[PDB]
Amino acid sequence: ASVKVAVRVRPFNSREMSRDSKCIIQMSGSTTTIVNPKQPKETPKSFSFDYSYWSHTSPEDINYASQKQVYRDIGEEMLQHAFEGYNVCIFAYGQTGAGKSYTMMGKQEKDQQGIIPQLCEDLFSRINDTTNDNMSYSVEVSYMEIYCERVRDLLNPKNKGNLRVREHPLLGPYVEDLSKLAVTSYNDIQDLMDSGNKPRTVAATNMNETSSRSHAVFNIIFTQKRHDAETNITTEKVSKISLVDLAGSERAGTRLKEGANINKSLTTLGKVISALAEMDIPYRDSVLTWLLRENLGGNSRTAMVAALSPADINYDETLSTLRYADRAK
Ligand SMILES: Nc1ncnc2c1ncn2[C@@H]1O[C@H](COP(=O)(O)OP(=O)(O)O)[C@@H](O)[C@H]1O
Numbered sequence: 207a208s209v210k211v212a213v214r215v216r217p218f219n220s221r222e223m224s225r226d227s228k229c230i231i232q233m234s235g236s237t238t239t240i241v242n243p244k245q246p247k248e249t250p251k252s253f254s255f256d257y258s259y260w261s262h263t264s265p266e267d268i269n270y271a272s273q274k275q276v277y278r279d280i281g282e283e284m285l286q287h288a289f290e291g292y293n294v295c296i297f298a299y300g301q302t303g304a305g306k307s308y309t310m311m312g313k314q315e316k317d318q319q320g321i322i323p324q325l326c327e328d329l330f331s332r333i334n335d336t337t338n339d340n341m342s343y344s345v346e347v348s349y350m351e352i353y354c355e356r357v358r359d360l361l362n363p364k365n366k367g368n369l370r371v372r373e374h375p376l377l378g379p380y381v382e383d384l385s386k387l388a389v390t391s392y393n394d395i396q397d398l399m400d401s402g403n404k405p406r407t408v409a410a411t412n413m414n415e416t417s418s419r420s421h422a423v424f425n426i427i428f429t430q431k432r433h434d435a436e437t438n439i440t441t442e443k444v445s446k447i448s449l450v451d452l453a454g455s456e457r458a459g460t461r462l463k464e465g466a467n468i469n470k471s472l473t474t475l476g477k478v479i480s481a482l483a484e485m486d487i488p489y490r491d492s493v494l495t496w497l498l499r500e501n502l503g504g505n506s507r508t509a510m511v512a513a514l515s516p517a518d519i520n521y522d523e524t525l526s527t528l529r530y531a532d533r534a535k
């Protein structure tokens with residue numbers, strides 16, 4: 207489908223433990239229900255999505271949506287679409303602390319790797335097992351943060367902050383001077399991910415709290431070169447894969463300019479995705495949607511995973527997230 211939407215509820219976090227929070231989220235099949243802690247006698251509000259992932263307990267539970275399960279449902283098919291020659295995009299949306307980064311990047315031990323590392327590993331595994339000498343590939347990667355209309359290159363510590371998105375008169379949007387590195391193995395792209403993830407949480411990022419107030423975009427340019435025994439000509443097939451970890455949705459203590467930009471960005475993205483779902487568009491209303499325009503076109507495939515806190519104390523924000531995800535359909 208043109209657009210796929212999933213929601214995922216995580217285990218209680220420290221804040222919720224400290225408040226003795228009750229779980230107000232329940233899931234069954236494709237449906238997620240949310241209880242209003244102040245109106246517990248009511249029938250919970252219900253929402254249906256392509257996927258409703260119950261990740262509130264732990265991998266020890268038979269009924270726990272693992273990193274692997276999430277990837278195999280959404281990531282795997284997006285990768286397949288990329289191999290067919292089309293652009294794809296996966297967005298993680300939701301309140302700060304809901305589980306966006308965990309879902310997209312995840313962790314290392316007990317292999318809690320998220321969508322991005324799993325997709326990258328899958329990509330290279332498929333490439334290396336290629337047993338057709340007429341097929342060769344190239345994998346180029348860019349990793350950046352979009353904060354208040356400015357782009358930060360997470361793969362270049364020296365540059366720092368500042369880049370601007372521009373519109374080439376004929377070739378579309380691009381970030382001037384943004385690093386685009388060729389990678390020939392999973393280990394190498396994993397080194398880049400690690401380095402970039404490190405950059406997102408260094409001490410200085412706490413000044414403007416960019417780990418939660420900026421949009422992190424991991425881009426892969428996948429080129430497939432097909433050789434012809436006869437004619438000896440090579441036809442190319444380029445696919446653009448954009449894996450995005452959005453700024454916290456509650457921020458849409460917040461600076462007026464920060465909030466304005468995050469609100470505008472998340473709001474425009476919602477309009478874009480809803481339009482794409484309707485066909486199966488004001489891209490320049492925000493830098494995020496402008497830069498990703500070609501990944502959000504009629505030919506592209508997009509998916510969103512909306513992270514949810516399970517706690518009573520976040521009812522309002524969680525309901526807002528469910529409604530946002532619902533509209534994206
Ligand atoms: N499904 C999950 N299972 C286990 N831990 C999770 C899950 N989702 C999120 N977490 C944990 O919750 C915390 C917050 O998630 P995180 O991705 O950092 O939030 P966000 O990126 O939306 O601000 C992290 O400390 C992370 O380890």
Ligand SMILES: [Mg+2]
Pocket residue numbers: 306307308417418451
């Ligand atoms: Mg995060």
